Amino acid sequence: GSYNKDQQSAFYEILNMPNLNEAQRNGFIQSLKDDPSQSTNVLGEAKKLNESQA
Amino acid sequence: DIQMTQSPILLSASVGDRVTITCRASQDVNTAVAWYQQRTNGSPRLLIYSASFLYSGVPSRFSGSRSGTDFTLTISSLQPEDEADYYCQQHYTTPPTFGAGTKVEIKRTVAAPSVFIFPPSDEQLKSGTASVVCLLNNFYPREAKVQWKVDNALQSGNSQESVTEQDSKDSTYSLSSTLTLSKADYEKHKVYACEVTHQGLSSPVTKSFNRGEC
Amino acid sequence: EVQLVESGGGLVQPGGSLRLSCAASGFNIKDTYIHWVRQSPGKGLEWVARIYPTNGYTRYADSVKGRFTISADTSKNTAYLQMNSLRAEDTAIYYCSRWGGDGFYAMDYWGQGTLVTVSSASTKGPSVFPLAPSSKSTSGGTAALGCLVKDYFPEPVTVSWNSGALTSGVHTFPAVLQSSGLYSLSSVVTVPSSSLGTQTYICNVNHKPSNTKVDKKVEPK
Amino acid sequence: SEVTIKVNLIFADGKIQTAEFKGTFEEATAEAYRYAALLAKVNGEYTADLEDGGNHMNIKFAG
Ligand SMILES: OC[C@@H](O)[C@@H](O)CO
């Protein structure tokens, strides 16, 4: 499917996170595709995990 | 009452040209005349008040003058965003009255339209009517001929046109022609064609589709 | 900033009544004249009435005298137009304006206008259909898509794209009255061909008179 | 009936504008000539060439 500029931005953030491994990166991207209503929540958990793996 | 007679009805000029439009009071109104601009579906904008005074924030290319009962509005260097209706109004006596308006159009180089066609949506086709849309995009001049053919039969009486306001930047027009048929009739025929004749095209352009094609 | 905001316009039957309001801000209507001016669809401007709120002096166009009344409440900085015994020819956008503000003997500020429709016809919300981009709506690497907003009454409808984020290349056509007595229009937008399938395109359609709000996603067929 | 008189306005420097005047044939005629006289004050003496039974004019200004 296609995405608005907001969904694109969440994708971009998770794609660029330096401390995620690729299983985690793609898992979070998959969640963004799964449920757009959860974009903010998903991004927040991705950030927490990225920070904890610094 | 006092009537205000505006002239011309329509004036068309190139970007950078000086244009003058006029307004005549049926009797003395001293200098009690204002000019308004109206465009892009917006409210009237005051340009000039008391015949010759420029309202704050209005570009200096606008000016007004009076000679007896004759009032003029002049635009010294016409810009594309000046395409509009212009109205004069007197307040010398009650009722305050308006001129009937002058429309200013921008003259520019000829541009042939991009011609596109849209079959009825599957969503519309669930119920009983079919709308076919022919789109002519970003062309000049406004004059264009759009004819519908269904299985090569010329259609009449079942289409309507709409045209956009002259574009604020590139001074082009766009036009839609919509053919309306019953769903039953749409499903009975195969070839749907929009034929466009325009000065910018070396010969008429037909845009078409077969019902059912991807 | 000086501002005037009209409200109250809507569909009314012939012989019916409507009340418009004109809310002023950024100045006091006690210091100016307030006018109502109307405009029939596709026609010129016509003065309707005026009031000087400081002393309540009023004047009317002959065509509305006795049927319309203008008034003001300086405590609410608002003017009003009561419209009774309405007729088809009263159909128009009604603007309020000020005159004499800051010493300017002209109408220097106007509201956005409110539409009054006098008709026996009933309110009807639009159907919103996709105009899907296809091989038949693309050339030169750009593609046209849109929404058909069909069969509504009365005017107006508004259309935006992607909640106002998409404005370039948009053409929203003037509504046209169909033989059915219902309005229809299309709004189209031209975008890069390469963006189809990756960028979401949604037309946001609002028909306030029927409380119809539709967000229609438009994608390739 | 209401008629439209179409006018080409041809200025000395080769610039061209077009205008339309509407009303009865006699009103529109009078307005077209009035407008020409007005423009002539700034743009030079005019000449008006009539075509199509007077429904079209070519109005040239001397500069
Ligand atoms: O949209 C109104 C603006 O273009 C004018 O005031 C200048 O012509």
CA C145 – CA C195 distance, rounded (Å) = 12
Note whether B111 and B65 are within 8 A (CB).
no
* Solving technique: X-ray
Ligand 1 atom closest to the Cα of residue B42 is 1
> Resolution, rounded to a tenth of an Å?
1.8
Question: Which residues, in sequence order, are bridge partners of residue C161?
Answer: C166, C203
CB B66 within 8 A of CB B51: yes
Ligand 1 atom nearest B168 alpha carbon: 4
Cβ-Cβ contacts under 8 Å between B and C: the total is 135
- Taking the CA of residue B39 as reference, the ligand 1 atom at the shortest distance is 1
The residue out of B85, B108, B131 marking a domain boundary is: B108
Amino acid letter at C165?
A: A
Q: Which residues contact A26 (CB under 8 A, 6 or more apart)?
A: none
Contact B125, B29 (CB under 8 A): no
Minimum distance, in Å, between the CA of residue A12 and any CA atom of chain C: 14
- CA B87–ligand 1 middle distance (angstroms): 14
Side-chain-side CA neighbours of residue B58 (13 Å): 20
DSSP state of B157: S
Tell me the C-alpha distance between C186 and C176, whole Å. Answer: 10
- Total count of domains within chain A: 1
CA distance D34 to chain B (A): 9
d(C-alpha B171, C-alpha B141), whole Å = 9
Q: Which residues line ligand 1 (CB under 6 A)?
A: B 37, 39-40, 45, 59, 81-82
Contact between chains at B124 and C137 (C-beta distance less than 8 A): no
Q: Are strands C127-131 and C18-25 parallel, antiparallel or unpaired?
A: unpaired
Tell whether the torsion through CA atoms of C169, C172, C173 and C178 is positive or negative: positive
| Cβ burial, residue C119 (10 Å; 0-12/13-18/19+) | middle
Residue ranges per domain, chain D? 1-63
The C-alpha R_g of chain A, in whole angstroms, comes to 10
Phi and psi at C164, nearest 5°, equal: 95, -10
The 3-class SS string of B25-64 reads ECCCCCCCEEEEEECCCCCCEEEEECCCEECCCCCCCEEE
Cα–ligand 1 centroid distance for B81 (angstroms): 6
Q: What are phi and psi of D3, to 5 degrees?
A: -125, 160
CB B176 within 8 A of CB B133: yes
The strand ranges marked E within chain B are: 4-7, 10-14, 19-25, 33-38, 45-49, 53-54, 62-67, 70-75, 84-90, 97-98, 102-107, 114-118, 129-139, 145-150, 153-154, 159-163, 173-182, 191-197, 205-210
CA distance C108 to C31: 14
C11/C102 same-domain check? yes
Q: What CA–CA distance (Å, rounded) separates B49 from B55?
A: 7
With H, G, I as helix, E, B as strand and everything else as coil, classify residue C90: helix
How far is it, in rounded angstroms, from Cα A14 to Cα A12? 6
| Whether residues B25 and B85 fall in one domain | yes
| CATH class of the D1-63 domain in this structure | alpha beta
Residue C165: list chain A partners with CB under 8 A.
5
Q: Which domain holds residue A16?
A: 1-54
Which tokens belong to B97? 């009255």
**Residues of B engaging D, defined by a Cβ cutoff of 8 Å:** 5, 7-14, 17, 19-20, 22, 70, 72, 107
Q: How far is Cα C58 from Cα C148, in angstroms, rounded to an integer?
A: 45
Which residues of C are less than 8 Å from A7 in CB distance? Answer: 200
Protein residue whose Cα sits closest to atom 4 of ligand 1? B81
**Paired tokens of C141:** 């690497």
CA–CA gap between residue A38 and residue A35 (Å, rounded):
6
Q: Which region, left, alpha or beta, applies to residue B212 given φ > 0 means left and ψ of -120 to 50 means alpha?
A: left
Helix A5-16 and helix A22-34: axis angle, to 10°?
A: 170
Give the burial class of D22: count Cβ atoms within 10 A of its Cβ; 0-12 exposed, 13-18 middle, 19 or more buried. Answer: middle
CA dihedral (B45, B50, B56, B60) in degrees, to 10, reads: 90
Which CATH number belongs to the domain containing residue C190 in this structure? Answer: 2.60.40.10
Q: Structural domain tally of chain C?
A: 2
Taking contacts as CB-CB distances below 8 angstroms, the residues of chain B near C22 are: none
Within 8 A of D10 by CB-CB distance, chain B residues are: none
Q: In angstroms, how far is CA C23 from the centroid of its own chain?
A: 17
- If one residue of B15, B43, B45, B83 were mutated to test the ligand 1 pocket, choosing by the most ligand atoms within 8 A of its CB, it would be B45
Write out the two tokens for C69.
């009344």
Do C135 and C112 sit in the same domain of this protein? no
* DSSP 3-state of C128: strand
Domain CATH code at residue B8: 2.60.40.10
Cis peptide before C41 (omega within 30 of 0): no
Residue in chain B closest to C104 (alpha carbons) equals: B49
Q: With beta carbons less than 8 A apart as the criterion, state whether A14 and A43 touch.
A: yes
Rounded to 10°, the helix A5-16/A39-52 angle is 10
C77 C-beta neighbours (distance < 10 Å), count: 17
Residues for chain A: how many in total? Answer: 54
Q: Is B161 part of the contact surface with chain C (CB cutoff 8 Å)?
A: yes
Buried b (16+ CB within 10 A) or exposed e, C1-28: eeebebebbebbeeeeebebbbbbeebe
Contact C148 B124 (CB under 8 A): yes
Q: For chain C, give me the number of helices (H) and strands (E)?
A: 0, 19
Q: How far apart (Å, rounded) are the C-alpha atoms in residues B74 and D32?
A: 17
User: DSSP labels for A1-54?
Assistant: --B-HHHHHHHHHHHH-SS--HHHHHHHHHHHHH-GGGHHHHHHHHHHHHHHT-
Closest CB from C99, C106, C110 relative to B43: C110
User: What is the DSSP secondary structure assignment for residue D31, as one 8-state letter?
Assistant: H
The tokens for A47 are 């950030």
Distance CA C75, CA C207 (A): 33
Nearest-angstrom CA–CA distance, C166 and C217: 14
The first and second tokens of residue B203, run together, are 């010969």
Q: Which amino acid is at B55?
A: Y
Distances (CA, A) of D63 to D12, D15, D18: 5, 11, 18
Q: Are C116 and C134 within one domain?
A: no
Which of B29, B121, B124, B129 best tests the C interface by mutation, with the highest count of C CBs <10 A? B121
Same domain, C40 and C106: yes
**Which domain, by its residues, includes C181?**
121-220
Q: What is the DSSP string of D39-61?
A: HHHHH--EEEEEEGGGTEEEEEE
Q: Do A4 and C162 touch (CB under 8 A)?
A: yes
Assess D31–B contact: CB distance below 8 Å, yes or no.
Answer: yes
**Which residues, 6 or more positions from C96, have their beta carbon under 8 angstroms from its beta carbon?**
C4, C6, C20, C22, C34, C35, C36, C37, C79, C81, C110, C111
- Measured between beta carbons, which residues in chain C are less than 8 angstroms from residue A39? none
Q: What total number of domains does chain B contain?
A: 2
- Are B182 and B92 found together in one domain? no
Q: Alpha-carbon Rg of chain D, whole angstroms?
A: 11
Helix, strand or coil, per DSSP, at residue B188: helix
Retrieve residue C203's tokens. Answer: 């037309």
Residue span of the structural domain in which B189 resides: 109-211
* Contact predicate C48/C61, CB 8 Å: yes
The chains in contact with chain A, meaning 3 or more Cβ pairs closer than 8 Å, are: C
Cβ(B212)–Cβ(B122) below 8 Å: no
Can you tell me the distance from the alpha carbon of B96 to that of C96, in angstroms, rounded to the nearest whole number? 14
Length of chain D: 63
Q: What's the start-to-end Cα distance of chain A, in Å?
A: 33
| Residue C88, burial from CB neighbour count under 10 angstroms (0-12, 13-18, 19+) | exposed
Main-chain dihedrals φ then ψ at residue B205, nearest 5 degrees: -105, 125
d(CA B168, ligand 1 centre) in Å:
9
Q: Supply A36's token pair.
A: 């757009």
- Residue A39 gets the label, from left (phi > 0), alpha (psi -120 to 50) or beta, of alpha
